């Protein structure tokens, strides 16, 4: 076992000696280290001044580095410090995690408009201060019109986007790499030989496992096409392409030939659906072939590498992707490394509620779907807006109840498939700032439809009290009263134009005029 150095907050400990050490690295995970410390040889008392000074320097949020020669085994921040006392015996345990742990802190909501997944992901890492690279992942260049994170931390949001875009996360100690899972078959290969010479890889204990309880034969993704009013073209995925020979996840025979079908209620273009379908299939088929191999300790192993078994026979020969590497240091066994194959199964964090919203100033819809820009206080606090579809009591081709809400109205916001990216308006409500023209009353006599916008007022009024239905635009009005007359009042002229006019009265017709009655025509025949 080579020299192990442990630097906490830049310096090495003087009172505590490392008894144990275990470092874990995994794909789509936050690497962690566990260190057990203690005072050796009764050099100092545990409650002495020097020992307590080191105790206060090992508090959480301190920086911890584990290094062999120049190679950096681990770099991170202490998250947990534990003390063990039993009689005269004492022991300290430290747990530190990768700087990716900082993505798990916080709980907020924000909106991304006209940004690609690469831009959003790079922004999240920059806030935590993490360098990142992207390899063989062109699918992250697609631009989302509106991407919403709702009441979750950056880690949960990132994990949802990784699956939806079919990408894996390799947590390097200095650089975090995002790569398509199928692109990892071309990585470096560490080969284990059954018939071996004296300089090959020594295998101590091994594990292998083939399962089919969660292996779908096909995955179908279908989406609702708003423009065509039809379900989009179905996309089928039949393979994962991970591994080769007997360690390939595709070599496992499925239970049944059935299909796993998703039919979303929101639009989704063909390219994004294909990546989502592939990400779903890889998620379920990742753990078809799994196992663990324990070898002599070495720092050249990294997650994402290819592990090949050669010469072990027709039942084990193949290749697989190393999804995790663990380093174990102890006095009894020295330095040992464990390699892991497979991964346990895990699109957008969901809304569940009904939300209020404010209709914004008019903006043209980019997709020409007639959506209305609204501001949702919960989903965001910035000046950017969201586009939501409008629900109407009646709507058909070239007809319907078309009363578009004015800017500033309060509306009820619902979401399609509980997705924050697809809001819909279910109705407008009245508030102490937009007074309702009619207040609720004991008798509820009057119903109406007013369009008052200052001094201008146009309405259609149903009144149960006097049993009238009226149309009025300002002072001009037209009233129909049951068991009474039809009254037509105007504050100005009254013009009636028609081809023929037939005014008939069962009792009498009494025309009038205060300054003249001019009866024109070409043949005035009285009788």
């Amino acid at each position: 076992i080579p020299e192990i150095t442990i630097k906490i907050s830049g310096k090495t400990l003087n009172q505590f000696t490392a008894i144990n050490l275990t470092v874990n690295h995994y794909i789509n995970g936050i690497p962690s280290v566990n260190i057990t410390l203690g005072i050796a040889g009764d050099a100092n008392y545990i409650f002495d001044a020097k020992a307590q000074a080191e105790l206060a320097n090992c508090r959480p949020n301190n920086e911890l580095i584990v290094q062999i020669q120049k190679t950096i085994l681990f770099k991170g921040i202490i998250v947990r410090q534990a003390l063990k006392f039993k009689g005269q015996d004492s022991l300290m345990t430290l747990t530190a995690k990768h700087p990716l742990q900082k993505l798990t802190d916080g709980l907020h909501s924000q909106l991304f408009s006209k940004q690609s997944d690469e831009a959003i992901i790079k922004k999240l890492f920059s806030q935590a201060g993490i360098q990142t690279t992207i390899k063989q992942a062109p699918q992250l260049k697609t631009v989302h019109e509106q991407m919403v994170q709702f009441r979750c931390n950056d880690w949960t949001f990132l994990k949802s986007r990784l699956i939806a875009t079919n990408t894996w996360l390799l947590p390097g100690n200095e650089v975090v790499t995002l790569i398509t899972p199928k692109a990892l078959n071309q990585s470096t290969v560490h080969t284990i030989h059954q018939s071996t010479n004296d300089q090959d890889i020594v295998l101590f204990e091994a594990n292998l496992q083939w399962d089919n309880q969660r292996s779908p034969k096909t995955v179908s993704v279908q989406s609702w096409d708003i423009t065509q009013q039809k379900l989009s073209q179905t996309i089928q995925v039949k393979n994962s392409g991970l591994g080769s020979n007997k360690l390939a996840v595709d070599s496992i025979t499925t239970l049944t030939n059935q299909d796993w079908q998703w039919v979303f209620n929101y639009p989704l273009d063909n390219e994004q659906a294909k990546y989502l379908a592939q990400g779903i299939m890889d998620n379920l088929r990742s753990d078809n072939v799994s196992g663990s191999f324990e070898v002599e300790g070495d720092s050249c192993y990294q997650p994402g590498d290819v592990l090949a078994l050669n010469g072990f026979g027709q039942g084990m020969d193949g290749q697989g992707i190393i999804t995790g590497v663990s380093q174990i240091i102890n006095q009894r066994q020295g330095w040992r490394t464990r390699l892991t194959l497979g991964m346990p199964p895990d699109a957008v964090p969901p809304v569940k509620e009904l939300h209020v919203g404010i209709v914004e100033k008019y903006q043209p819809d980019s997709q020409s779907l007639g959506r209305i820009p609204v501001k949702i206080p919960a989903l965001n606090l910035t000046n950017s807006v969201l586009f939501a579809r409008l629900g109407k009591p009646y709507a058909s081709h070239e007809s319907g109840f078309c009363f578009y809400p004015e800017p500033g109205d309060e509306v009820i916001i619902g979401f399609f498939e509980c997705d924050p990216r697809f809001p819909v308006i279910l109705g407008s409500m009245h508030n102490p700032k937009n007074k309702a023209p009619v207040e609720p009353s004991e008798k509820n006599p009057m119903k109406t439809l007013v369009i008052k916008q200052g001094d201008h007022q146009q309405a259609l009024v149903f009144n149960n009290q006097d049993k009238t239905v009226a149309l009025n635009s300002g002072k001009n009005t037209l009233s129909l009263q049951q068991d009474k007359d039809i009254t037509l009042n105007s504050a100005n002229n009254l013009i009636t134009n028609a081809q023929e006019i037939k005014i008939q009265a069962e009792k009498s017709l009494s025309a009038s005029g205060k300054s003249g009655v001019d009866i024109k025509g070409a043949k005035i025949n009285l009788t």
Binding site: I19, N20, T36, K84, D89, S90, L91, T93, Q213
Partner: peptide, 28 residues
């Protein structure tokens, strides 16, 4: 397997294997 340092080793090994089986059964 008597003092604190070794008891941490043995119990952690049992914890890791117990946790893996329980998690598999719960997800099953």
């Amino acid at each position: 397997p008597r003092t604190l340092a070794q008891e941490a080793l043995d119990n952690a090994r049992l914890i890791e294997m117990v946790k893996q089986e329980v998690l598999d059964a719960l997800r099953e």
